[PDB]
């Protein structure tokens, strides 16, 4: 807020707007009807008690076909004032049929709905006071617009179209530092980047990039920032950067270009820098599939977080704004939790009961997790780690891989997803697999897991995960054993099998070429540069991607620090753990910066496997 990104301050605006709208609906007893996908987000913002006390609504429901049978049971009952639906139409451009069938059948006499949208900063605070009646109606907005958007398909029943545009802007839930935008799923639980229908990839990609650009524009115009340097990586990031630049340069108002002349300008500057490094998940498919070792990573891949940051099996919330025990243990390694918990418990003995309840709950949950790690296919949780560590450095032999893949297939029972992920990593690590092993691996797969597995192994065999030795979308076509020489991923590191992520070193090289100095270096343009630059580092990335055009460096202004590292394609939460380590080590070395990680939705190995199915 006001050039200082007070992230928690973003939370209040959405709640205030929703409360004002709901209280301005009607001063009676209201019943709320909320879409299943958006409800968890709303509950993570407004508590039930606050919702009841602030506005006279007293009931919340869900959009389901069960309501059709309950139309004469639930909808017929209550209905003290009216029914206020809440829908999300930001993606999939289609209203759910539930409201369509309920409107005509139950014959509601008052239809009011709520639709979500990003904040229209271009409205610039209603533009003063309409310029004293538009200086004699010199400007007007009647019919100066298309008749309807998306909701033009709603042209049935009555004219009760009291729409209400509730505003929404990103706010942090999992942690103070990192915000999160939900644009990676539809209402049908289909991945927005890896859809299970290989006929409409291009449109889905365009829609995703458009929505991401819209969210970034909303945040940028809300915070009143001036981007100075852009480091785009990949193909889609190029289009995203160009579209964002065009949209910023088109829709910006006046009274700020004048400031753009005063600040920065010609022959002078004021020492303000913001960076917009952008990456794509397809660039490095090496590390969304490794096993998590941090506490929240282990707790995540065994029990999937929903849209809200909570879990079904437990009841206590993991929100950071009311508890401090979770703050200091979320990103620590699993091994260093026990003794720390023992010390925390023993120090309080000499020494309010809410802390006791919190520590008891944490101890019980940790004990349950430790118990469930073992005795549940004992040794698998470690065996996969040793196998992954062996594969990453490279120890594959002639036809011996077929012996170990089925070694744990039925000796220890294991899910399909683990095997599929491991074989994908095997096929991806060597950057190529010969033509004499697919004929056996695919045969065994189709033998053991049905007939539909052939379709999965065919569809997944074109995104780059499952390739054969015999508009490129920026795949990776270089052996990984080479990358272990330029970079020092395998020696400082946690949340993995002792391996540094590839994105980690990719962002490291932009500011300090130390590891690149040890290997493949005789001269460098610099050793410590404050501004992001890319020079004399083309050939290494020319062979790494097959084209010396993936790297893009853009300077916008002609002539401590906020860096916006967005993530198009999900964030593997282990990267968040190493981001803090990067910030700490860079601050120690001398360069002081602050990182904000924009995420389109948490991504994880198993969560990917159901996507392409």
């Amino acid at each position: 807020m006001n050039r200082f990104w007070n992230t928690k301050k973003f939370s209040l605006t959405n709640a205030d707007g929703l409360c004002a709208t709901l209280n301005e609906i009607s001063q009676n007893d209201e019943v709320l009807v909320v879409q299943p996908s958006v409800l968890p987000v709303l509950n993570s913002l407004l508590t039930f008690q606050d919702l009841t006390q602030s506005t006279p609504v007293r009931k919340i429901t869900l959009l389901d076909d069960q309501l059709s049978d309950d139309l004469p049971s639930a909808l017929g009952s209550v209905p003290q004032m009216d029914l206020i639906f809440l829908i999300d139409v930001r993606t999939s451009l289609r209203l759910p049929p539930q409201l369509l069938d309920a409107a005509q059948k139950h014959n509601l006499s008052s239809l009011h709905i709520i639709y979500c949208r990003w904040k229209p900063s271009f409205q610039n605070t209603l533009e003063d006071t309409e310029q004293w009646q538009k200086d004699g109606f010199d400007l007007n907005s009647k019919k100066t617009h298309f008749p309807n958007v998306i909701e033009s398909q709603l042209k049935e029943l009555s004219n009760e179209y009291t729409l209400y545009p509730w505003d929404l802007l990103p706010f942090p839930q999992i942690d103070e530092n990192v915000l999160l935008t939900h644009s990676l799923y539809n209402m049908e639980n289909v991945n927005m980047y890896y859809p299970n229908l290989r006929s409409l990839q291009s449109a889905t990609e365009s829609i995703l990039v458009d929505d991401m650009v819209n969210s970034l524009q909303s945040l940028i115009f809300e915070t009143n920032s001036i981007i100075t340097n852009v480091v785009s990586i990949g193909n889609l990031s190029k289009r995203c950067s160009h579209l964002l630049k065009k949209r910023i340069d088109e829709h910006q108002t006046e009274n700020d270009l004048f400031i753009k002349g005063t600040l920065y300008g010609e022959r002078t500057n004021c020492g303000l820098e913001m960076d917009l490094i952008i990456l794509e998940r397809n660039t490095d498919p090496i590390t969304p599939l490794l096993t998590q070792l941090t506490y929240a990573g282990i707790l995540d891949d065994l029990y999937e977080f929903n849209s809200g940051i909570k879990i079904k099996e437990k009841d206590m919330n993991f929100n950071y704004k009311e508890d401090k025990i979770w703050n200091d243990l979320k990103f620590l390694n699993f091994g260093s939790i026990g003794p720390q918990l023992n010390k925390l418990a023993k120090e309080l003995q000499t020494q309010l009961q809410q802390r006791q309840a919190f520590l008891k709950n944490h101890t019980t949950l940790s004990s349950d997790v430790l118990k469930v790690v073992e005795t549940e296919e004992y040794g698998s949780f470690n065996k996969i780690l040793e196998l992954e560590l062996e594969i990453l450095m490279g120890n594959t032999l002639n036809n011996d891989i077929e012996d170990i893949i089925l070694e744990l297939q039925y000796q220890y029972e294991v899910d399909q997803k683990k095997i599929l992920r491991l074989i994908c990593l095997l096929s991806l690590c060597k950057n190529s697999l010969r033509e004499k092993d697919y004929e056996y691996l695919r045969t065994f797969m189709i033998d053991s897991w049905g007939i539909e597995k052939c379709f999965q192994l065919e569809s997944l065999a074109e995104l780059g995960f499952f390739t054969s030795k015999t508009s490129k979308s920026t795949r990776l076509q270089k052996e990984y054993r080479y990358i272990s020489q330029w970079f020092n991923t395998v020696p400082a590191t946690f949340a993995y099998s002792g391996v540094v992520p590839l994105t980690m070193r990719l962002v490291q090289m932009l500011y300090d070429r130390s590891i690149l100095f040890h290997n493949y270096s005789s001269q460098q343009p610099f050793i410590l540069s404050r501004e992001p630059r890319v020079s004399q580092t083309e050939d290494l990335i020319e062979q790494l991607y097959g084209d010396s055009h993936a790297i893009e460096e853009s300077i916008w202004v002609p002539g401590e620090d906020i860096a916006l590292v967005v993530f198009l394609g999900g964030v593997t939460m282990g990267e968040i753990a190493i981001m803090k380590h990067l910030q700490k080590i860079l601050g120690k070395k001398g360069i002081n910066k602050r990182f904000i990680i924009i995420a389109d939705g948490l991504i994880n190995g198993t969560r990917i496997m159901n996507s392409i199915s």
């Binding site: 310029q131 200086d135 004699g136 010199d138 400007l139």
Partner: protein, 100 residues
């Protein structure tokens, strides 16, 4: 006088002189008065009158003139040319209306 100038806004003065087909005088008051809001209101009227004027013209040269005269004006308010395109479409000229 000063008191009469208070009764009616500057737009009231600009209209009285735009009425009598004097499209260069008006555009000079706006420059000296240091205003931008009432700038495009002269240009839209001039374009409408020019389009609705000489009927025996040619599309390419008419568009060239109507777009070269737009280069001088650098301002975005009340500069809507949808009305100009409509009034061009209201008569036989269709290609020029589409090209505008």
């Amino acid at each position: 006088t000063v008191e009469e100038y208070r009764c009616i806004s500057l737009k009231g003065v600009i209209d009285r002189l735009l009425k009598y087909h004097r499209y260069y005088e008006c555009i000079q008051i706006c420059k000296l008065a240091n205003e931008r809001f009432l700038l495009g209101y002269v240009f839209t009227e001039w374009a409408k009158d020019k389009i609705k004027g000489s009927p025996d013209m040619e599309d390419d040269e008419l568009l060239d003139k109507i777009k070269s005269r737009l280069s001088v004006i650098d301002m975005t308010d009340t500069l809507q040319m949808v009305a100009v395109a409509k009034v061009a479409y209201l008569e036989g000229r269709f290609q020029l209306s589409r090209n505008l």
